[PDB]
């Protein structure tokens with residue numbers, strides 16, 4: 001995946 | 015993660 | 029992945 | 043995860 | 057991601 | 071993601 005999941009992944013340096 | 019990458023993930027069922 | 033990343037993933041349901 | 047999913051992730055620059 | 061890695065992901069339910 | 075899954079990811083090269 002969702003937009004929310006993607007934002008979290010991006011913030012965690014995926 | 016980008017919105018583009020998340021869309022690709024959803025398209026692949028990830 | 030790191031413990032920090034996995035916790036972020038866990039919080040987002042990844 | 044499937045080989046298809048792994049290929050899709052690499053195609054998206056994960 | 058490699059087939060080995062994807063196989064490991066399936067083994068762990070990721 | 072679980073701690074077990076995160077350990078498995080690291081074992082597989084993450």
Ligand SMILES: *Cc1cccc(-c2cccc(C*)c2)c1
Pocket residue numbers: 001009013014015023028037042056
């Ligand atoms: C869509 C998704 C779900 C779980 C984990 C991930 C992931 C894993 C490692 C690196 C990155 C950038 C994303 C994606």
Ligand SMILES: *Cc1cccc(-c2cccc(C*)c2)c1
Pocket residue numbers: 006009014015016019020022023024026027028047048050051052054055056
């Ligand atoms: C969160 C994320 C970042 C980069 C790539 C992907 C992705 C794209 C296509 C397929 C899969 C399994 C994952 C997700």
Ligand SMILES: *Cc1cccc(-c2cccc(C*)c2)c1
Pocket residue numbers: 005006008009010012013014029030033034036037038040041042079
């Ligand atoms: C979908 C998702 C949400 C938050 C964090 C992650 C993530 C980030 C870096 C590495 C890994 C394995 C997972 C994914």
Ligand SMILES: *Cc1cccc(-c2cccc(C*)c2)c1
Pocket residue numbers: 027028043044047048051052056057070
């Ligand atoms: C099935 C799947 C779910 C989440 C993430 C991935 C993946 C695959 C290859 C590379 C990356 C960064 C993430 C696959």
Ligand SMILES: *Cc1cccc(-c2cccc(C*)c2)c1
Pocket residue numbers: 048057058061062064065066068069070075076078079080082083084
């Ligand atoms: C797509 C991918 C790449 C490297 C490692 C893994 C993996 C292996 C075991 C468990 C988990 C959650 C992920 C997947």
Ligand SMILES: *Cc1cccc(-c2cccc(C*)c2)c1
Pocket residue numbers: 029037042065070071075079080083084
């Ligand atoms: C928490 C998680 C779920 C699915 C896939 C992964 C993953 C993908 C690519 C690389 C790594 C290190 C982990 C993580």
